[PDB]
Amino acid sequence: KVFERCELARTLKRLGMDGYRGISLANWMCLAKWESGYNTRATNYNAGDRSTDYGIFQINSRYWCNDGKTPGAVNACHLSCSALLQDNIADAVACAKRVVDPQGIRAWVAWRNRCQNRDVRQYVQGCGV
Catalytic residue numbers read: 35, 53
Nearer to Na ion, 40 or 61 (CB): 61
Of the candidate spans 17-25, 71-79, 107-115, 117-125, the one that interacts with Na ion by CB under 5 A turns out to be 71-79
Q: Does 60 sit near Na ion (CB under 5 A)?
A: no
Q: Does 66 sit near Na ion (CB under 5 A)?
A: yes
Q: Does 73 sit near Na ion (CB under 5 A)?
A: yes
Measured CA to CA, the distance from residue 19 to residue 28 in angstroms comes to: 9
Measured CA to CA, the distance from residue 116 to residue 110 in angstroms comes to: 9
The neighbour count for residue 120, using CB atoms within 10 Å, is 20
Alpha carbon dihedral 59, 62, 67, 72, in 10-degree steps, equals -170
Q: Does 61 sit near Na ion (CB under 5 A)?
A: yes
The binding site for Na ion (CB under 5 A) comprises: 61, 66, 73, 75
